[PDB]
Design a protein around this ligand. Structure first.
Ligand code: SFG
Lengths: 620, 6
């Protein structure tokens, strides 16, 4: 159910207006706290001595109504960046007064307009207000998609019309930078009569958009007179509905022969006819842009309620079963089916899902198998013992050890193990598998047979703000930027297509094994945008054509086990069209720990993040 | 932590 409100400038009486607006079906009302035309003076002597109340008292509504139903709008006559000293001084005083009154009321949100090239003084006043007191109101910067000077008609003889398509965004960015990416400043994207190129909308959708303002003049007239959005505004509204922005319908009823509610109703219709969420999206709901630390099973034991979520995925284990089936068919010919017994070793059996998959694969392939299930977490070993005693029986042998420290009784025909993370090697799968190789038969195979990790630059002020919010005390203040986070990228914009890095193959039988890696990636850029970090995905080949992947263009259908990973950078890197982002990644180890270092070089050389694993390491 | 995080 889409949450939408109403924007008004004439409010003769608050109670009646709220009643009517609620009756029409809106959720909240955006109004001016002070009368828009009631200019006020603070310096001039005769004028500033104005008696009587400045604005309607706050007792008019209950304390709850202000906190949920009202959104304050700054007076239009205020212009902090005026070029006249008296006007600017009065504007500063009035804006501070209005912000203070809004905070006093308890307003959930306050609207401020960005309809000028320069907003430095306004930003200064807003920043001063944000750092004073103990208020919590959010601030929505009403900024249009197309600057007013560009959408005006060409009816002036002395001045004909016409990077110019992006100027509005530059107004936002600068303002944001002046406020230092405050968590309390959001964007109220004011949609226009016509949309810009797809790239502009893509860049905008990466911004922290909280509300979208729809004028009543956008809607077209259908065959029966009801309002209807254009065919491209429809797609844009769908894209916004992918986010959870609130729609504010502004203007007057351009369709007098119909009730205003129609404008709302149509929106609701688009909300109800939105394409249904898929299984993956439904699974991921509630964790969009929710930073999480990766799992490091090699050093820290998992809990049962993590294996529970690991088991919900049906795609992963079906693919593993198919891979085992194909491998068993390939290795054992039909004539040798009777006596050829293949040895399978599951490494990291967990609570026995992969053991069940292997047994099922052998059963359907008609090939006999012996099974060794290795596991280190003793808690999972208890479950494996119960499974073995009750149901698997003699066919499965459970071992409680680390495969790097285990001494197998016989060599393995097939090795099966999933030890991958968001990044393919994030979970130290290569380190464990290389050690495990010592008990792998000469012609045996390993599943997965190979895995690669792909990296792609991203832009997301939301994620940058979360990373900054991960400021924990008793550690380096910059440490939060020097560690990866596994998170479902939702409010982000992809600057370029992912590229491969750090490929791994098993079994690796080169003369001297080395797991340290170094990769340099160059990403073209198509729009002036700010890079905030790099998102990492992984792809993997289990056996021949059987594969798993979370890369956006080849995502496995419905496989929701893994989320992308995020490597942030300390300072946003501004990049212009035609430039190339040159990032460099190092996977380093010292036989006791493993870490990742990353540095940007081409646009503007950045510092080497996480040197010598000072801020993030995986125990080995 | 559902997904691949804590
Ligand atoms: N070096 C290691 N030696 C032994 N077990 C390990 C090692 N590294 C990881 N593991 C185990 O591998 C398991 C990983 C799997 N359980 C994860 C989910 C998997 N689908 C399963 O249910 O088996 C955990 O029980 C880890 O304790």
């Amino acid at each position: 159910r889409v949450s939408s409100g109403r924007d008004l400038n004439c409010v003769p009486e608050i109670a009646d207006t709220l009643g009517a607006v609620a009756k029409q079906g809106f959720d909240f009302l955006c109004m001016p706290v002070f009368h828009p035309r009631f200019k006020r003076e603070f310096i001039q002597e005769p004028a500033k001595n104005r008696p009587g109340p400045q604005t309607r008292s706050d007792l008019l509504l209950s304390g709850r109504d202000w906190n949920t139903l009202i959104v304050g709008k700054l007076s239009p006559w205020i212009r902090p960046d005026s070029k006249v000293e008296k006007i600017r001084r009065n504007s500063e005083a009035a804006m501070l007064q209005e912000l203070n009154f809004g905070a006093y009321l308890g307003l959930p949100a306050f609207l401020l307009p960005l309809n000028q090239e320069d907003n430095t003084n306004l930003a200064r006043v807003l920043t001063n207000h944000i750092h004073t007191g103990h208020h919590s109101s959010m601030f929505w910067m009403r900024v249009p998609l197309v600057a007013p000077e560009d959408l005006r008609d060409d009816i002036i003889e002395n001045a004909p019309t016409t990077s110019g398509e992006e100027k509005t965004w530059m107004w936002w960015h600068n303002f944001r930078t002046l406020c230092d990416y405050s968590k309390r400043i959001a964007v109220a994207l004011e949609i226009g009569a016509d949309l810009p190129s797809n790239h502009v909308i893509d860049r905008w959708l990466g911004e922290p958009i909280k509300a979208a303002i729809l004028p009543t003049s956008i809607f077209l007239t259908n065959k029966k007179g009801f309002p209807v959005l254009s065919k491209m505004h429809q797609r844009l509204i769908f894209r916004l509905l992918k986010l959870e922005v609130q729609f504010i319908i502004t203007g007057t009823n351009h369709h007098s022969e119909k009730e205003f509610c129609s404008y709302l109703q149509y929106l609701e219709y688009l909300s109800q006819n939105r394409p249904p969420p898929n299984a993956y999206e439904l699974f991921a709901k509630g964790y969009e842009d929710y930073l999480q630390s990766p799992l490091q099973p090699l050093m820290d034991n998992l809990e049962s309620q993590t294996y529970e979520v690991f088991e919900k995925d049906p795609i992963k284990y079906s693919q593993y079963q198919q891979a085992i089936y194909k491998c068993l068919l390939d290795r054992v010919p039909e004539e040798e089916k009777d006596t050829n017994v293949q040895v399978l070793m599951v490494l990291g059996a967990g609570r026995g899902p992969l053991v069940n998959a292997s047994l099922r694969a052998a059963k359907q392939a008609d090939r006999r198998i012996k099974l060794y299930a290795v596991e280190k977490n003793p808690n999972a070993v208890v479950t494996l013992e119960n499974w073995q005693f009750e149901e698997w029986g003699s066919q499965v042998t459970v071992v409680s050890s680390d495969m790097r420290e285990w001494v197998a009784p016989e060599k393995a025909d097939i090795i099966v193990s999933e030890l991958l993370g968001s990044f393919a090697d994030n979970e130290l799968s290569p380190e464990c598998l290389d050690g495990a190789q010592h008990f792998l038969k000469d012609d045996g195979v390993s599943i997965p047979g190979e895995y690669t990790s792909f990296l792609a630059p991203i832009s997301s002020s939301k994620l940058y703000n979360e990373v900054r919010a991960c400021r924990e005390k008793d550690r380096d203040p910059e440490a939060q930027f020097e560690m990866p986070y596994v998170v479902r990228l939702h409010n982000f914009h992809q600057l370029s297509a992912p590229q491969p890095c750090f490929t791994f193959s098993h079994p690796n039988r080169d003369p001297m094994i080395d797991n340290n890696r170094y990769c340099t990636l160059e990403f073209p850029v198509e729009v002036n945008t700010v890079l905030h970090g790099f998102a990492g995905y992984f792809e993997t080949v289990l056996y021949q054509d059987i594969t798993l992947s979370i890369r956006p263009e080849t995502h496995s259908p419905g496989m929701f086990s893994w989320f992308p990973i995020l490597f942030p950078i300390k300072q946003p890197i501004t990049v212009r069209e035609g430039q190339t982002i040159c990032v460099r990644f190092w996977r380093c180890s010292n036989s006791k720990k493993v870490w990742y270092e990353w540095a940007v070089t081409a646009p503007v050389c950045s510092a080497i993040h996480n040197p010598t694993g000072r801020s993030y390491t995986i125990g080995l | 932590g559902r997904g691949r995080g804590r």
